[PDB]
Amino acid sequence: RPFQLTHGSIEHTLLVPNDLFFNYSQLKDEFIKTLPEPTEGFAGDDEPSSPAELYGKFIGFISNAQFPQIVELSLKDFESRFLDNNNDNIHSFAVKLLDDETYPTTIAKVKENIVKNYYKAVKSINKVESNLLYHCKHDAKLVAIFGGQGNTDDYFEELRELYTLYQGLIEDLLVSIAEKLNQLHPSFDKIYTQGLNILSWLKHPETTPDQDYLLSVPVSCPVICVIQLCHYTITCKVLGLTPGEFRNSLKWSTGHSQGLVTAVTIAASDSWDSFLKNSLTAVSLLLFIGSRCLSTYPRTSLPPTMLQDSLDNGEGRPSPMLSVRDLSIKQVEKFI
Amino acid sequence: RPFQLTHGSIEHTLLVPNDLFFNYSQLKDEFIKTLPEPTEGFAGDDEPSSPAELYGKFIGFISNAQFPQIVELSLKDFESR
Amino acid sequence: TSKAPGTNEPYAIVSGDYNPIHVSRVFAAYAKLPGTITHGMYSSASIRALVEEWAANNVAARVRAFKCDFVGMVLPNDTLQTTME
């Protein structure tokens, strides 16, 4: 008898080619033993909790196992099963999965198990798609903005999950970046002694220095540019867009306090290698900035009465820069 | 290893042709999911409660499923059995 | 709470104290002591800079005398918690 592909309390059974079930079952046997026990509706973070999520976890699993000619087959199957005429919308497919009732909504289990595994298993994404948010090539106007220094407290985790997710998209570039850093890292020792091996901190979380030294300027200044550049590389590659032609789509762009260097890189980026070279000149620049803006005004200790009071007043931990809201310029200049 | 055709608390395992087990198992997989849970000796009206009864329910099941050349084979098997 | 350094060599080259108890495994073993323990003077200056801000509210000229007793030894990278009374 022919029987069903199954798991847990949720199942997504697909039609394999009739002459593949044998070896197809080997991957399944290896897969079923890699999944934890079902938990009261799959509330466990690592077990899938929607049929599409299960199928995605499986497709990520088979991508590492040495058995090709199934990875892409099951991949196009996943497409036709969920992404027809929108077979480049797995992001939107993901955020739509957040709306299911069979699936208890949590974006974390949607990002991984679906998107991570897709681009982990997908072959060349180079299907030049529709810049159709600009499809009114005559009517819309895109402008890219690049964040500046200090928009968030815990920033390195953005790069953490980004590498966790699109590793196959950034691994080619960020290692070339970190190498160039290590070629310039020791030349500016004595100001960031805990090293600048980003690859270590990503491949090994415990090797990552504390957020404070991470929040240090000679540290945070280049990695923000790194985050922006990997984001740009991703949005160029998911669309399969060369950086220079994606730039052709934009009308103009500029950057904040810090990221403005990324903006001027984009305006000089034509190919991927040109992009890589200009990113190198960027992170080398912002590393100099981080070094010198600290060696010029080194942040020192602060009287604990001060910051204790400031945190009891609900204010922030004191820092060289203060943001005031809800007040016009003409009166803040009157208080200063 | 070769293993056994089975269900529930009663089993009627037959000898398939050696070159059919593959697709024969597909019908079984479709069949096992159409049967309710065993009930204290299969007191439920719709679950079979004798090996011949199980085999008959299976043979009715495969007759609708699009896979001939097994229906009559298993049928003459039921006869000889 | 404080933490011992990783290596005592930076302190040694600055303080001019090249005492091989703190820099070389072989001497630290010759004296049968637990290893390249931190420079006692470094451990002093560490707690001194600690109290200089936690007791004097980071006003440097307020401290006028400081004395301490190296009761125990500290191997590098050790995490040290102090009380202040």
Write the layout of secondary structure elements.
The structure is cut from a larger assembly and holds 3 copies of chain A.
Chain A: H1 21-32, H2 51-64, H3 71-82, H4 90-97, H5 107-121, E1 143-146, H6 156-165, H7 167-184, H8 198-203, H9 211-215, H10 217-237, H11 243-249, E2 252-255, H12 260-266, H13 272-296, H14 304-312, H15 329-335
Parallel strand pairs in A: 1-2
Helix pairs in contact in A: 2-3, 2-5, 4-5, 6-7, 6-10, 7-10, 7-13, 10-13, 12-13
Strand arrangement, major sheet of chain A: 1-2
Quaternary assembly: part of a larger assembly
Number of strands of chain A: 2
Name of the level-1 CATH class of the domain at 1-129 in chain A? Mainly Alpha
Question: Which architecture of the domain at 1-129 in chain A per CATH?
Answer: Up-down Bundle
Shape of chain A: globular
String of helices and strands of chain A: HHHHHEHHHHHHEHHHH
Q: State the share of residues found in helices of chain A, binned by percent.
A: 40-55%
N-end to C-end Cα span of chain A:
83 Å
Looking at CATH, which topology of the domain at 1-129 in chain A would you report? Glutathione S-transferase Yfyf (Class Pi), Chain A, domain 2
Q: Which range does the strand content of chain A fall in?
A: under 5%
The most extensive interface between chains reads:
A-B, 6 and 14 residues
Q: What does the radius of gyration of chain A come to?
A: 24 Å
Helix/strand/pairing class of chain A, anyone? mainly alpha
Determine the number of helices of chain A (DSSP H or I, runs of at least 4 residues). 15
Protein name (chain C): Fatty acid synthase subunit beta
Family (chain C): Belongs to the fungal fatty acid synthetase subunit beta family.
Domain MaoC-like (chain C): 1-85
Subunit structure (chain C): [Alpha(6)beta(6)] hexamers of two multifunctional subunits (alpha and beta).
